[PDB]
Write a protein that binds this ligand. Structure first.
Ligand SMILES: Cc1cc2nc3c(=O)[nH]c(=O)nc-3n(C[C@H](O)[C@H](O)[C@H](O)COP(=O)(O)O)c2cc1C
Ligand SMILES: Cc1cc2nc3c(=O)[nH]c(=O)nc-3n(C[C@H](O)[C@H](O)[C@H](O)COP(=O)(O)O)c2cc1C
Ligand SMILES: O=C(O)c1cccnc1
Ligand SMILES: O=C(O)c1cccnc1
Lengths: 219, 219
């Protein structure tokens, strides 16, 4: 709730990508539930929350991923928890998906038509998202990277290590998960994944570009 | 550095999108540098770190933004600080950008050709990023939304309010900032923005989907 600049900086400095997990250690259900809340409570463009969190504790499913998940093949067997994040497909301003968005905010027929023209201008004019399906999906997939970032940070504040994962064949992971009946492949598609647990090895040297190279002040 | 579940949960409940800032309150330079570090230290796919943070404190430049920034119109006049986050364009596995990435990790000719083979498979086969410029750019822009999320959360743990911003004409924001010579428009393009300051109104309550609607457990 309140931290000092030296605790805040250390909290973001201390989080590291953990590629080797201790299979003997596992996260508590209350610890992981608060990690998932970090995700659920994340902000998202126009309150869209275009995400779904699949928690893959089934061990037969983890083994089936191994062949096309080179980024986490040596993490799938030992991590305590695995999360695959999906992003909403085709979240157009006039889609049922956005009727639910407006409905969660209690919008009358007039409030909805004003919000609808705002969504349209955002998607069609401001960001040019309705050229094809991939650009619109990537917009919701961007929001899911917000939830991903917050789950990593919330985990690291609870002493739990993590690794974000993109190292897998999207097409094969999509098919494997949709054929296992875990989501409707016309409404959602995989966006990014993440492992959680406790490090087995040591945490390496934090390496990033300098602050003076990545910031330009405009005064 | 270490928080309890009540503190972590409260940290993500307390962060809210602030549309109304107190113009008499400014964030100190030391507080704002610690917010910028939160972004700099964020994880990124293959350590790409594909972001640049523009801090727009010039009030003439802010005023030039108001006509096409409906999402931020009143925030531009009262927020303490404004950050426009750029994402790298054309970040192909065989680009100079990725020679810099490999160079910061110190790889020899053998390690660079092995890593280049992994970047190739990741970008071309696994994620299908190389079918046009937009898909490759949107990959880096997803990374920058991680940096965005960490800046919002790091700011709120310091007691500083914020609001992520997508509500603006992107084409016109790219042009306006490139005409001030702030980046090379063939190397970078605007990804997302954020305002920071101290709110003038109180936090309204979280409205999110339930944990039971957005989490699917597979045991
Ligand atoms: C990427 C992104 C862009 C956003 N753009 C704007 C914006 O332009 N203007 C605005 O007022 N709010 C914007 N929001 C704020 C969201 O509406 C807000 O996150 C959501 O309604 C949830 O509220 P909370 O953030 O207050 O929890 C944006 C949020 C995100 C994540
Ligand atoms: C979106 C995303 C995907 C990532 N994918 C993988 C991955 O598949 N496998 C992996 O080992 N690390 C992956 N990483 C970890 C990064 O390589 C790591 O974050 C970065 O190099 C910085 O190191 P640090 O996080 O330990 O500081 C990923 C990171 C991000 C952000
Ligand atoms: O998220 C919002 O509420 C929002 C986004 C863009 C423009 N106006 C509002
Ligand atoms: O970020 C990495 O280190 C990474 C990303 C994808 C696949 N393997 C490694």
């Amino acid at each position: 709730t309140q931290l000092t600049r030296e605790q805040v900086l250390e909290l973001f400095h201390q989080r590291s990508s953990t590629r080797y997990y201790d299979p003997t250690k596992k996260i508590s259900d209350e610890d992981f539930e608060c990690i998932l809340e970090c995700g659920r409570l994340s902000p998202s463009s126009v309150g869209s929350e275009p995400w779904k969190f699949l928690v893959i504790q089934n061990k037969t499913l983890r083994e089936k991923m191994k062949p096309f998940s080179w980024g986490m093949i040596n993490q799938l067997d030992n991590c305590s928890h695995l999360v695959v994040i999906l992003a909403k497909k085709n979240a157009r301003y006039d889609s049922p998906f956005f009727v639910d968005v407006m409905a969660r905010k209690g919008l009358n027929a007039e409030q909805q038509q004003a919000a609808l023209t705002k969504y349209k201008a955002l998607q069609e004019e401001d960001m040019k998202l309705l050229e094809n399906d991939r650009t619109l999906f990537d917009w919701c997939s961007k929001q899911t990277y917000i939830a991903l970032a917050n789950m990593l940070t919330g985990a690291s504040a609870l002493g739990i290590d993590s690794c974000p994962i993109e190292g897998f064949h999207y097409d094969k992971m999509n098919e494997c998960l949709a054929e296992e009946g875990l989501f409707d492949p016309q409404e959602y598609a995989v966006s990014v994944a993440a492992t959680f647990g406790y490090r087995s090895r040591d945490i390496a040297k934090k390496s990033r570009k300098g602050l003076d190279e990545v910031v330009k002040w405009v005064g």
